[PDB]
Design a protein around this ligand. Sequence first.
Ligand SMILES: [Zn+2]
Lengths: 7, 105
Amino acid sequence: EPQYEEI
Amino acid sequence: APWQAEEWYFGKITRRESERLLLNAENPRGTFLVREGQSQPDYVLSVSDFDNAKGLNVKHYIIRKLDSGFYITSRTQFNSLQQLVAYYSKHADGLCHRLTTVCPT
Ligand SMILES: [Zn+2]
């Protein structure tokens, strides 16, 4: 539900 | 001294408290902190980012624990969390900007 960043 | 005594480790704080502490207008690009997860279990690298077509925002990167080790992507692995902080404070290497300053309390 929360947004994280994928390198 | 243990890595948890370091001024960039904020321990158990919410995603909102992270973002409120980082979104101070007095902080440069590359202000960051390492926190405990809230939604998910793994540690989180929370960085302030200025995007020219969006503005000032906070990105969250999940620091996954290698069962063997830490990494944000499986392509760059670090033996400690301080060795992950020290690398990205020198090379963006897939971050929007390199880590410059420890976030103020
Ligand atoms: Zn950006």
